[PDB]
Coordinates of C-alpha atoms and ligand atoms in Angstrom, one line a residue:
Chain W
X1 CA 5.3 -27.5 -15.2
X2 CA 8.4 -29.9 -16.3
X3 CA 11.0 -27.9 -18.4
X4 CA 11.1 -28.7 -21.7
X5 CA 14.0 -30.7 -24.0
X6 CA 13.6 -30.6 -27.7
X7 CA 11.1 -32.0 -29.2
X8 CA 11.2 -34.7 -32.4
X9 CA 10.7 -33.2 -35.4
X10 CA 8.5 -35.9 -36.3
Chain J
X1 CA 21.5 -59.2 -35.2
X2 CA 17.8 -60.0 -35.7
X3 CA 17.3 -57.7 -38.5
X4 CA 20.2 -58.5 -40.3
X5 CA 17.9 -60.7 -42.9
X6 CA 15.7 -57.6 -43.6
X7 CA 16.0 -55.4 -47.0
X8 CA 17.2 -51.7 -45.5
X9 CA 14.4 -50.5 -47.5
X10 CA 11.9 -52.6 -45.7
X11 CA 13.4 -51.8 -42.2
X12 CA 12.6 -47.8 -43.0
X13 CA 9.1 -48.8 -44.3
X14 CA 8.5 -51.1 -41.0
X15 CA 9.9 -48.3 -38.8
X16 CA 7.5 -45.7 -40.3
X17 CA 4.5 -48.3 -39.6
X18 CA 5.5 -48.9 -36.1
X19 CA 5.5 -45.0 -35.8
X20 CA 2.1 -45.1 -37.1
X21 CA 1.3 -47.6 -34.7
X22 CA 2.8 -45.9 -31.8
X23 CA 5.6 -49.0 -31.5
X24 CA 8.4 -47.5 -30.6
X25 CA 10.4 -50.3 -29.7
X26 CA 9.7 -52.0 -32.4
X27 CA 10.4 -48.9 -34.4
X28 CA 14.0 -48.6 -32.4
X29 CA 14.9 -52.3 -33.5
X30 CA 13.7 -51.5 -37.2
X31 CA 15.8 -48.3 -37.3
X32 CA 19.0 -50.0 -35.4
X33 CA 19.0 -52.6 -38.0
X34 CA 18.8 -49.7 -40.8
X35 CA 21.8 -48.3 -39.3
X36 CA 23.4 -51.7 -39.0
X37 CA 23.5 -51.9 -42.6
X38 CA 26.3 -49.7 -42.7
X39 CA 25.1 -46.7 -44.9
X40 CA 24.8 -43.4 -44.3
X41 CA 21.3 -42.0 -43.1
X42 CA 19.2 -39.2 -45.1
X43 CA 17.6 -36.1 -43.1
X44 CA 14.2 -38.2 -42.8
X45 CA 16.0 -41.6 -41.6
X46 CA 17.8 -39.8 -39.1
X47 CA 14.5 -38.3 -37.4
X48 CA 13.2 -41.8 -37.3
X49 CA 16.0 -43.2 -35.5
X50 CA 15.9 -40.3 -33.1
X51 CA 11.9 -40.3 -32.7
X52 CA 12.3 -44.1 -32.0
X53 CA 14.9 -43.9 -29.4
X54 CA 13.6 -40.9 -28.0
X55 CA 10.3 -42.5 -26.8
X56 CA 11.5 -45.5 -25.7
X57 CA 14.0 -44.1 -23.4
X58 CA 11.7 -41.2 -22.5
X59 CA 9.1 -44.0 -21.1
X60 CA 11.8 -45.4 -18.8
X61 CA 13.2 -42.1 -17.7
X62 CA 9.5 -41.6 -16.5
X63 CA 9.4 -45.1 -14.9
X64 CA 12.7 -44.6 -13.4
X65 CA 11.5 -41.2 -11.8
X66 CA 8.2 -42.6 -9.9
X67 CA 10.4 -45.4 -8.9
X68 CA 13.0 -43.1 -7.7
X69 CA 10.7 -41.0 -5.8
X70 CA 9.3 -43.8 -4.1
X71 CA 12.5 -45.2 -3.3
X72 CA 13.3 -41.5 -1.6
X73 CA 10.1 -41.5 0.6
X74 CA 11.0 -45.1 1.6
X75 CA 14.5 -43.9 2.9
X76 CA 12.9 -41.1 4.8
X77 CA 12.7 -41.2 8.8
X78 CA 10.1 -42.9 10.1
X79 CA 9.2 -44.8 7.1
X80 CA 8.3 -48.5 7.5
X81 CA 10.7 -51.0 6.4
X82 CA 9.6 -52.5 3.2
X83 CA 12.6 -54.9 2.2
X84 CA 14.6 -54.3 -1.2
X85 CA 11.9 -54.8 -3.6
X86 CA 11.6 -50.8 -4.3
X87 CA 15.6 -50.6 -4.8
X88 CA 15.9 -54.0 -6.8
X89 CA 13.2 -52.7 -9.4
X90 CA 14.3 -49.2 -9.7
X91 CA 17.9 -50.9 -10.5
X92 CA 16.1 -53.3 -13.2
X93 CA 14.5 -50.2 -15.0
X94 CA 17.9 -48.0 -14.3
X95 CA 19.7 -51.0 -15.9
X96 CA 17.2 -51.1 -18.9
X97 CA 17.5 -47.7 -19.5
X98 CA 21.4 -47.8 -19.5
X99 CA 21.4 -50.5 -22.2
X100 CA 19.4 -48.6 -24.2
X101 CA 21.6 -45.2 -24.0
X102 CA 24.7 -47.8 -24.3
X103 CA 23.0 -49.0 -27.6
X104 CA 22.2 -45.7 -29.2
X105 CA 25.8 -44.4 -28.2
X106 CA 27.2 -47.3 -30.0
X107 CA 25.3 -46.6 -33.2
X108 CA 26.5 -43.4 -33.0
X109 CA 30.1 -44.5 -32.2
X110 CA 29.9 -47.5 -35.0
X111 CA 30.0 -45.6 -37.2
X112 CA 27.4 -42.7 -37.9
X113 CA 29.4 -40.0 -36.5
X114 CA 32.9 -40.7 -38.2
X115 CA 30.9 -40.8 -41.5
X116 CA 28.8 -37.7 -40.9
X117 CA 30.7 -35.1 -43.2
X118 CA 27.7 -32.2 -43.6
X119 CA 27.0 -29.9 -40.7
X120 CA 23.2 -31.0 -40.4
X121 CA 24.1 -34.6 -40.1
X122 CA 27.1 -34.3 -37.9
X123 CA 25.4 -31.7 -35.6
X124 CA 22.5 -34.0 -35.3
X125 CA 24.5 -37.3 -34.4
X126 CA 26.9 -34.9 -31.9
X127 CA 23.4 -33.7 -30.1
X128 CA 22.2 -37.3 -30.0
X129 CA 25.6 -38.3 -28.2
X130 CA 25.2 -35.4 -25.9
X131 CA 21.7 -36.3 -25.1
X132 CA 22.0 -39.9 -24.5
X133 CA 25.2 -39.4 -22.0
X134 CA 22.8 -36.9 -20.3
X135 CA 20.1 -39.5 -19.7
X136 CA 22.8 -41.5 -18.6
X137 CA 23.8 -38.8 -15.9
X138 CA 20.4 -38.3 -14.8
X139 CA 20.8 -41.7 -13.2
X140 CA 24.6 -41.8 -12.6
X141 CA 25.7 -42.0 -9.0
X142 CA 29.4 -43.5 -8.6
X143 CA 32.8 -43.1 -9.4
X144 CA 32.0 -42.4 -13.1
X145 CA 29.4 -39.5 -12.8
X146 CA 31.7 -36.7 -13.3
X147 CA 33.3 -38.5 -16.3
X148 CA 29.6 -39.4 -17.8
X149 CA 28.7 -35.5 -17.4
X150 CA 31.7 -34.3 -19.0
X151 CA 31.2 -36.2 -21.9
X152 CA 27.7 -35.1 -22.6
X153 CA 29.2 -31.6 -22.4
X154 CA 31.9 -32.2 -24.7
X155 CA 29.4 -33.8 -27.3
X156 CA 27.3 -30.6 -26.8
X157 CA 30.1 -28.6 -27.0
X158 CA 31.4 -29.8 -30.3
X159 CA 27.9 -29.9 -31.8
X160 CA 27.6 -26.2 -30.7
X161 CA 30.7 -24.8 -32.2
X162 CA 29.9 -26.4 -35.8
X163 CA 26.4 -25.3 -35.4
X164 CA 27.5 -22.0 -34.8
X165 CA 30.1 -21.8 -37.7
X166 CA 28.3 -23.7 -40.2
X167 CA 23.9 -23.2 -39.5
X168 CA 21.9 -19.9 -39.2
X169 CA 20.6 -19.2 -35.5
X170 CA 16.9 -20.3 -36.8
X171 CA 18.2 -23.8 -37.7
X172 CA 15.6 -26.3 -35.8
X173 CA 18.5 -28.4 -35.0
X174 CA 20.8 -25.9 -34.0
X175 CA 17.9 -24.3 -31.8
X176 CA 17.1 -27.9 -30.3
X177 CA 20.7 -28.5 -29.7
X178 CA 21.1 -25.0 -27.7
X179 CA 17.6 -26.0 -25.8
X180 CA 19.1 -29.2 -24.5
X181 CA 22.4 -28.1 -24.1
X182 CA 21.0 -25.2 -21.7
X183 CA 19.0 -28.2 -19.9
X184 CA 22.2 -29.8 -19.4
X185 CA 23.7 -26.8 -18.0
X186 CA 20.3 -26.3 -16.0
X187 CA 19.8 -29.8 -13.9
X188 CA 23.0 -31.7 -14.9
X189 CA 25.7 -29.4 -14.6
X190 CA 24.5 -27.2 -11.8
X191 CA 24.8 -24.2 -13.9
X192 CA 21.4 -22.6 -14.1
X193 CA 23.2 -19.2 -15.0
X194 CA 24.8 -20.5 -18.0
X195 CA 21.3 -22.4 -18.6
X196 CA 19.4 -19.0 -18.5
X197 CA 22.2 -17.1 -20.6
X198 CA 22.3 -19.5 -23.6
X199 CA 18.6 -19.8 -23.7
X200 CA 18.2 -16.0 -23.7
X201 CA 21.0 -15.7 -26.6
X202 CA 19.5 -18.5 -28.5
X203 CA 15.9 -17.2 -28.5
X204 CA 17.5 -13.6 -29.4
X205 CA 19.5 -14.2 -32.3
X206 CA 17.0 -16.4 -33.8
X207 CA 14.2 -13.8 -33.3
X208 CA 16.7 -11.3 -35.4
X209 CA 17.0 -14.0 -38.3
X210 CA 13.3 -14.9 -38.4
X211 CA 13.0 -12.1 -41.1
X212 CA 15.0 -14.6 -43.7
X213 CA 12.7 -17.4 -43.6
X214 CA 9.5 -18.6 -45.5
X215 CA 6.2 -19.1 -43.8
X216 CA 7.1 -22.9 -43.2
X217 CA 10.5 -22.4 -41.6
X218 CA 9.3 -19.6 -39.6
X219 CA 6.7 -22.1 -38.2
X220 CA 9.5 -24.6 -37.5
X221 CA 11.5 -22.3 -35.9
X222 CA 9.4 -20.3 -33.7
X223 CA 8.0 -23.6 -32.1
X224 CA 11.3 -24.3 -30.7
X225 CA 11.6 -20.7 -29.7
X226 CA 8.7 -20.7 -27.7
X227 CA 10.1 -24.0 -25.8
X228 CA 13.2 -21.6 -25.0
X229 CA 10.9 -19.0 -23.7
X230 CA 8.8 -21.2 -21.8
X231 CA 12.1 -22.8 -19.9
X232 CA 13.0 -19.2 -19.3
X233 CA 9.7 -18.1 -17.9
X234 CA 10.2 -21.4 -15.4
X235 CA 13.5 -20.7 -14.6
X236 CA 13.7 -16.9 -13.8
Chain U
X1 CA 10.1 -69.3 -15.4
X2 CA 12.3 -65.7 -14.4
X3 CA 10.3 -65.2 -11.9
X4 CA 10.8 -68.7 -10.2
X5 CA 13.5 -67.5 -7.5
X6 CA 11.4 -64.2 -6.5
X7 CA 9.2 -64.5 -3.3
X8 CA 5.5 -64.2 -3.9
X9 CA 5.1 -61.3 -1.9
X10 CA 7.8 -59.4 -3.7
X11 CA 6.1 -60.3 -6.8
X12 CA 3.0 -58.6 -5.6
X13 CA 4.9 -55.6 -4.1
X14 CA 6.7 -55.2 -7.7
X15 CA 3.4 -55.7 -9.5
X16 CA 2.1 -52.7 -7.8
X17 CA 5.2 -50.7 -8.3
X18 CA 5.2 -51.5 -12.1
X19 CA 1.5 -50.5 -12.1
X20 CA 2.4 -47.0 -10.6
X21 CA 5.2 -46.7 -13.0
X22 CA 2.8 -47.6 -15.9
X23 CA 5.3 -50.3 -16.9
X24 CA 2.4 -52.9 -17.5
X25 CA 4.4 -55.5 -19.7
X26 CA 6.8 -55.5 -16.3
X27 CA 3.4 -56.1 -14.2
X28 CA 2.3 -58.7 -16.0
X29 CA 5.5 -60.7 -16.2
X30 CA 5.6 -60.0 -12.1
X31 CA 1.8 -61.4 -11.6
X32 CA 2.4 -64.3 -14.1
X33 CA 5.2 -65.2 -11.7
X34 CA 2.9 -64.8 -9.0
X35 CA 0.3 -67.0 -10.4
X36 CA 2.8 -69.6 -11.0
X37 CA 3.3 -70.3 -7.4
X38 CA 0.6 -71.9 -7.7
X39 CA -1.9 -70.6 -4.6
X40 CA -5.1 -69.1 -5.1
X41 CA -5.3 -65.1 -5.6
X42 CA -7.1 -62.6 -3.4
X43 CA -9.4 -60.5 -4.9
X44 CA -7.1 -57.5 -4.8
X45 CA -4.6 -59.9 -6.8
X46 CA -7.0 -61.0 -9.3
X47 CA -7.3 -57.3 -10.2
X48 CA -3.6 -57.0 -10.4
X49 CA -3.6 -59.6 -12.6
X50 CA -6.3 -58.4 -14.6
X51 CA -5.2 -55.0 -14.9
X52 CA -1.8 -55.7 -16.3
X53 CA -2.6 -57.9 -19.0
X54 CA -5.6 -55.9 -20.2
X55 CA -3.0 -52.9 -20.6
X56 CA -0.7 -55.1 -22.4
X57 CA -3.2 -56.7 -24.8
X58 CA -4.8 -53.3 -25.1
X59 CA -1.7 -51.6 -26.5
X60 CA -1.3 -54.4 -29.0
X61 CA -5.0 -54.3 -30.2
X62 CA -4.7 -50.9 -30.8
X63 CA -1.7 -51.6 -32.5
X64 CA -2.9 -54.0 -34.7
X65 CA -6.0 -52.0 -35.6
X66 CA -3.8 -49.3 -37.5
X67 CA -1.8 -52.0 -39.0
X68 CA -5.0 -53.9 -40.2
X69 CA -6.5 -50.4 -41.5
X70 CA -3.2 -49.8 -43.5
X71 CA -3.2 -53.0 -44.8
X72 CA -7.0 -52.8 -46.2
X73 CA -6.2 -49.6 -47.5
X74 CA -3.3 -51.3 -49.7
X75 CA -5.4 -53.8 -50.9
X76 CA -7.8 -51.7 -52.2
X77 CA -8.1 -50.9 -56.2
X78 CA -6.0 -48.4 -57.5
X79 CA -3.2 -48.6 -54.6
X80 CA 0.0 -48.6 -55.5
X81 CA 1.9 -52.2 -54.9
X82 CA 4.5 -51.7 -51.8
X83 CA 5.3 -55.5 -51.2
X84 CA 4.8 -57.6 -48.1
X85 CA 6.1 -55.4 -45.4
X86 CA 2.7 -54.1 -44.1
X87 CA 1.2 -57.8 -44.1
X88 CA 4.6 -59.1 -42.5
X89 CA 4.6 -56.3 -39.6
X90 CA 0.8 -56.9 -39.1
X91 CA 1.5 -60.7 -38.8
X92 CA 4.3 -60.0 -36.1
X93 CA 2.0 -57.8 -34.2
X94 CA -0.9 -60.2 -34.4
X95 CA 1.5 -62.9 -33.3
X96 CA 2.8 -61.3 -30.2
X97 CA -1.0 -60.4 -29.4
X98 CA -2.0 -64.2 -29.8
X99 CA 0.9 -65.1 -27.7
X100 CA -0.3 -62.7 -24.8
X101 CA -3.6 -64.1 -25.1
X102 CA -2.3 -67.6 -25.0
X103 CA -0.3 -66.7 -22.0
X104 CA -3.6 -65.6 -20.2
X105 CA -5.7 -68.3 -21.0
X106 CA -2.9 -70.9 -20.2
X107 CA -2.8 -69.7 -16.5
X108 CA -6.7 -69.8 -16.5
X109 CA -6.5 -73.3 -17.3
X110 CA -3.5 -74.2 -15.1
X111 CA -4.6 -74.0 -12.7
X112 CA -6.7 -70.7 -11.8
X113 CA -10.1 -71.6 -13.1
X114 CA -10.3 -74.9 -11.4
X115 CA -9.2 -74.3 -7.8
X116 CA -11.8 -71.0 -7.7
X117 CA -14.8 -71.9 -5.8
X118 CA -16.5 -68.6 -4.8
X119 CA -18.7 -67.1 -7.1
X120 CA -16.5 -64.0 -7.2
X121 CA -13.1 -65.6 -8.0
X122 CA -14.7 -68.0 -10.6
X123 CA -17.1 -65.4 -12.1
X124 CA -13.9 -63.2 -12.6
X125 CA -12.0 -65.9 -14.2
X126 CA -14.5 -67.0 -16.6
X127 CA -15.2 -63.3 -17.6
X128 CA -11.2 -63.0 -18.6
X129 CA -11.4 -66.4 -20.2
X130 CA -14.0 -65.0 -22.6
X131 CA -12.1 -61.6 -22.9
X132 CA -9.2 -63.4 -24.4
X133 CA -10.8 -65.9 -26.7
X134 CA -12.7 -62.4 -27.6
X135 CA -9.5 -60.5 -28.2
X136 CA -8.3 -64.0 -30.1
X137 CA -11.6 -63.9 -32.5
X138 CA -11.1 -60.1 -33.4
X139 CA -8.1 -61.3 -35.5
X140 CA -9.0 -64.7 -36.4
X141 CA -9.8 -65.5 -39.9
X142 CA -8.9 -69.2 -40.5
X143 CA -11.0 -72.3 -40.0
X144 CA -10.7 -72.3 -36.1
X145 CA -12.5 -68.7 -36.2
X146 CA -15.9 -70.4 -35.5
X147 CA -14.1 -72.5 -32.9
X148 CA -12.4 -69.5 -31.0
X149 CA -16.1 -67.4 -31.0
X150 CA -17.5 -70.6 -29.4
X151 CA -15.1 -71.2 -26.8
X152 CA -15.5 -66.8 -25.8
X153 CA -19.3 -67.6 -25.8
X154 CA -19.0 -70.5 -23.7
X155 CA -16.9 -68.8 -20.9
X156 CA -18.9 -65.9 -21.0
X157 CA -22.2 -68.2 -20.8
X158 CA -20.9 -69.9 -17.8
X159 CA -19.8 -66.7 -16.0
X160 CA -23.4 -65.4 -16.8
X161 CA -25.0 -68.2 -15.3
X162 CA -23.2 -68.3 -11.9
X163 CA -23.3 -64.4 -11.6
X164 CA -27.1 -64.5 -12.0
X165 CA -27.6 -67.3 -9.5
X166 CA -24.9 -65.9 -7.0
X167 CA -24.2 -62.3 -7.2
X168 CA -26.7 -59.4 -7.0
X169 CA -27.4 -57.5 -10.0
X170 CA -25.2 -54.5 -9.2
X171 CA -22.3 -56.5 -8.3
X172 CA -19.3 -54.8 -10.3
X173 CA -18.1 -57.8 -11.7
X174 CA -21.6 -59.2 -13.0
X175 CA -21.9 -55.6 -14.6
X176 CA -18.8 -55.8 -16.3
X177 CA -19.1 -59.2 -17.6
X178 CA -22.5 -58.3 -19.1
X179 CA -20.8 -55.6 -20.5
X180 CA -18.3 -57.3 -22.3
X181 CA -20.5 -60.5 -23.2
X182 CA -22.9 -57.5 -25.0
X183 CA -19.8 -56.2 -26.8
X184 CA -19.2 -59.7 -27.8
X185 CA -22.9 -60.2 -29.2
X186 CA -22.4 -57.1 -31.1
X187 CA -19.2 -57.2 -33.1
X188 CA -18.1 -60.5 -32.7
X189 CA -21.1 -63.0 -32.8
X190 CA -22.8 -60.5 -35.4
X191 CA -25.9 -60.1 -32.9
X192 CA -26.5 -56.6 -32.2
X193 CA -30.0 -57.4 -31.2
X194 CA -29.0 -59.7 -28.4
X195 CA -26.3 -57.1 -27.5
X196 CA -29.1 -54.2 -27.2
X197 CA -31.3 -56.4 -25.0
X198 CA -28.5 -57.5 -22.9
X199 CA -27.5 -54.5 -22.1
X200 CA -30.6 -52.8 -21.2
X201 CA -31.5 -55.7 -19.2
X202 CA -28.8 -55.2 -17.1
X203 CA -29.3 -51.9 -16.8
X204 CA -32.7 -52.0 -15.5
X205 CA -32.0 -54.9 -13.3
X206 CA -29.1 -52.9 -11.6
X207 CA -30.9 -49.6 -11.4
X208 CA -33.6 -51.4 -9.4
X209 CA -31.3 -52.7 -6.8
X210 CA -29.7 -49.5 -6.4
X211 CA -31.3 -48.7 -3.5
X212 CA -29.9 -51.3 -1.4
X213 CA -26.3 -50.1 -1.8
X214 CA -23.9 -47.8 0.3
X215 CA -22.7 -44.6 -1.5
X216 CA -19.4 -46.3 -2.2
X217 CA -21.0 -49.4 -3.8
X218 CA -23.7 -47.1 -5.6
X219 CA -20.7 -45.0 -7.1
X220 CA -19.0 -48.3 -8.2
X221 CA -22.3 -50.0 -9.9
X222 CA -23.2 -46.4 -11.6
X223 CA -19.9 -46.1 -13.0
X224 CA -20.2 -49.6 -15.2
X225 CA -23.9 -48.7 -15.8
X226 CA -23.2 -45.3 -17.3
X227 CA -20.9 -47.5 -20.0
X228 CA -23.9 -49.5 -20.6
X229 CA -26.0 -46.4 -21.3
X230 CA -23.0 -45.0 -23.8
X231 CA -23.1 -48.3 -25.7
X232 CA -27.0 -48.5 -25.9
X233 CA -26.5 -44.8 -27.3
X234 CA -24.0 -45.8 -29.6
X235 CA -25.9 -48.7 -30.9
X236 CA -29.5 -47.3 -31.2
Chain P
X1 CA -16.7 -42.8 -30.4
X2 CA -15.7 -46.3 -29.9
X3 CA -18.1 -48.7 -27.9
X4 CA -17.0 -49.2 -24.1
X5 CA -16.1 -52.7 -22.9
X6 CA -15.2 -53.0 -19.4
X7 CA -12.8 -51.0 -17.4
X8 CA -10.6 -52.3 -14.6
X9 CA -11.4 -52.2 -11.1
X10 CA -8.0 -50.6 -10.8
Ligands
CL1 CL1 13.0 -56.5 -10.1
CL2 CL1 7.9 -57.8 -39.4
MG3 MG1 22.1 -14.6 -11.6
MG4 MG1 -34.7 -54.6 -33.7

């Protein structure tokens, strides 16, 4: 699994 | 600019249509046109700008990673020489990616950041500045790599300072900023301990503030906290 | 043309890289350049050409369908007037889609089809011609819609005649041609009975020939037969 | 479900 970065609010 | 003749409101309306159609290059061009009208962006408009370019650059980054991996295998011992094509095409995608990052950074510098006075807008844009310098850093290999990394660090740091002073620990922009700055530490700045410390402190301070939130705000905050937790699980 | 300075083999190599990177616009531009070198295409090269443009136009068709649906709702009774933007943006996507179809049809006409003498290549290209006229027909609403539909029909019909004479009933190109001609009947030509009859006869004649095939050919043929069966299930 | 058309060999 690839680390998360911040998702888009939309 | 090709969007100069279209009304600002029509650009925003079409950005939303392009989003529904998953046409993110079009969406980004519409939002670039809306920014270039010169008025500040609302919270929703900032999110439309961010979603469009995130998706565009996300596709380029994914493609660059595929090509870079192929190129690295081609340079292993015992690999058959295939000519310059892999490098050429990786450079093509890389140049297009850099162009998108430069475009976004140019919008922030002319003149989104200097007009942004509220904490929510100023932190949002500074996070974006850190993000797009981080994407430049992912592909940087030359004499400017250190300066690119420091530009990302500086933008994130200013955003963190403002967010800590002006926003609650559960604010989703503050949380996503800390998430991305922690990824910067982990895989750009070679500082995994700093990445882990930031992710944990961010999670723990948000946990302690959840009790202040409505049900809908609780949902928004816990969603990003779970991403911090997932990264901590991956990293420890 | 921008690919005029690149070697044919380098274009093919980069088309394969773009495929791996899911960069289908790049893939299509590389294969257009390879076609424009003027030499016939091998079986693999024909498939690279087809995959690239199928993916490009598939994204445009999906987007056009989203926008057309929004536009249709906007023209219902009691819908609030939102201005020309929905129509404008649907027309933009539609025009880009038509341009891609015209590009593909132009490659087939100059000069892929006229040089294609073997059944496998000639049927492949005529199926493609039918496909891209069918995609034009999906968005056509004016005085040329009937002529567009008849151009698709004619290309498919010539491909069917050759395929029936020159190829076994299990050949995957023959099967995919019949599948697409059956979809043409069902949703373009308003002939669902013809669509169902073609799908059933195609399935049944392939079933009876499976016994002649190796394990790998059996897998290739049954895969497309299952798509015919799925359409029959949907349609009956 | 949307009807199938022919997939790409590749
Ligand atoms: Cl290239
Ligand atoms: Cl438009
Ligand atoms: Mg330690
Ligand atoms: Mg009947």
